[PDB]
Structure 1
């Protein structure tokens, strides 16, 4: 499902990250990052696709042999040490509807503004559904892409759970 170009660029990024895991020191990594870029550059203009696929196929085998068994992972990336760390603090917005009236009374201005967002969501829903109906082929949607708002005064269909989603550091 990834094109040839996408596969080659993903291999380049992945190989540089494992290379940086081996080198550690910045000056050393710069030296070998340039040598590695030269190898990708040596075949940049290959035109016979059969030949290029063989090059990519072999490069992936070379990457597998030489990968770091413990590559650096950004802390919040999947598999990182802080991945999903703050999920226990992410509370969905609908929980606020169940607050006791004395709890809402502590934030009169926040809850007035929240009531306006719910009004906006309600007034916009039927137009959002209608736009999706009239823009979707007869069989159904063939990709997961969603359209923008067309008319002025409309909102992009299916926006609520993207716009009102929890903050990355909710506390």
Structure 2
């Protein structure tokens, strides 16, 4: 979720994703670790059997038949990590994530507590203000006239420069905000 996507996935990416998905579902079917190790080694052997096939039509046909095999043989209730998109704790803490701009609306009595925190916040705000034009300039110069082909962003190439469009990535609330 941090890397920019590409226009497509190559054959190698597709077969690797199939390998990982099939291994995860196999682990869902084989609850115990020794049985999982056995059948996962068998799965790896089955994948290695055609590791160096050079006929792209044949490789594509084999990958397609593998997909058809997986869809029929998938676990209807696969194991999901608790914070993964299908898990039981996927977006549980989103109600606690509060954007930092809300701090600007605190009453001065609220800001009277935490003086050091708000002095540091003022320094951060000044830093964000002072480097915006350089970041915009960098983006315009680097990008092609038609527009940007991909969502990849450039790093800071000078010394006193920050990477363009950094504020919202850096000031993410937290993963356990409260």
Which bin holds the TM-score, normalised by the shorter protein? over 0.9
Count of equivalent residues: 171
Question: 1:17: how far off?
Answer: 0.3
Deviation, 1:74, is 0.3
Quick one: distance in 1 between partners of 2:73 and 2:54?
A: 27
> Do structure 1's residue 136 and structure 2's residue 143 form an aligned pair?
yes
Task: Classify the secondary structure of the residue corresponding to 1:78.
Answer: coil
- Show the counterpart of 1:42: 49
TM-score (norm 2): 0.96
- Superposition CA RMSD, Å: 0.4
Q: Which runs of 4+ in 1 moved over 2 A?
A: none
CA shift, 1:7, in A, is 0.2
Q: What do the CA deviations read for 1:45-90 (whole angstroms, capped 9, x no partner)?
A: 0011110000000000000010000000000000100000000000
TM-score, normalised by the number of residues in structure 1: 0.99
- Once residues 77 and 100 of structure 2 are traced to their aligned partners in structure 1, the CA distance between those partners, rounded to angstroms, is 38
Separation of aligned partners in 1, 2:173 and 2:31: 36
State the match for 1:15 in structure 2: 22
Q: Which runs of 5+ in 2 are unaligned?
A: 1-7
1:91-135 C-alpha deviation (Å, 9 max, x unpaired): 000000000000011100000000000000000000000000001
Greater relative CO (CA pairs within 8 A, separation 6+): 2
